[PDB]
Amino acid sequence: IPTNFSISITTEVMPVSMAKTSVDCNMYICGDSTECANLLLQYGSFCTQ
């Protein structure tokens, strides 16, 4: 049977959020080539999905 107590305080770290990233495929795909967009629009909604 214990006779004395010991009040302790522990810590616990848990992530709840991350980096809200947003990549624009208009600049990533077809950076500056104006003729590149004509072929990029041929694929479809890969920049929308």
Partner: protein, 49 residues
């Protein structure tokens, strides 16, 4: 004095001395992004932001 142009960590052109004179800086990236549409609801009104 020997470096004319300079890249960034992402390997993109960031600044370069003026090749003629004045020894000045150079372009900066333009503005872009994903434009979103805010609508309070077509049943209530037809506003848009």
């Amino acid at each position: 004095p020997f470096q004319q142009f300079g890249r960034d960590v992402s390997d993109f052109t960031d600044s370069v001395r003026d090749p003629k004179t004045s020894e000045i800086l150079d372009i900066s990236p333009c503005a872009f992004g994903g434009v979103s549409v805010i609508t309070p609801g077509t049943n209530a009104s037809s506003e848009v932001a």
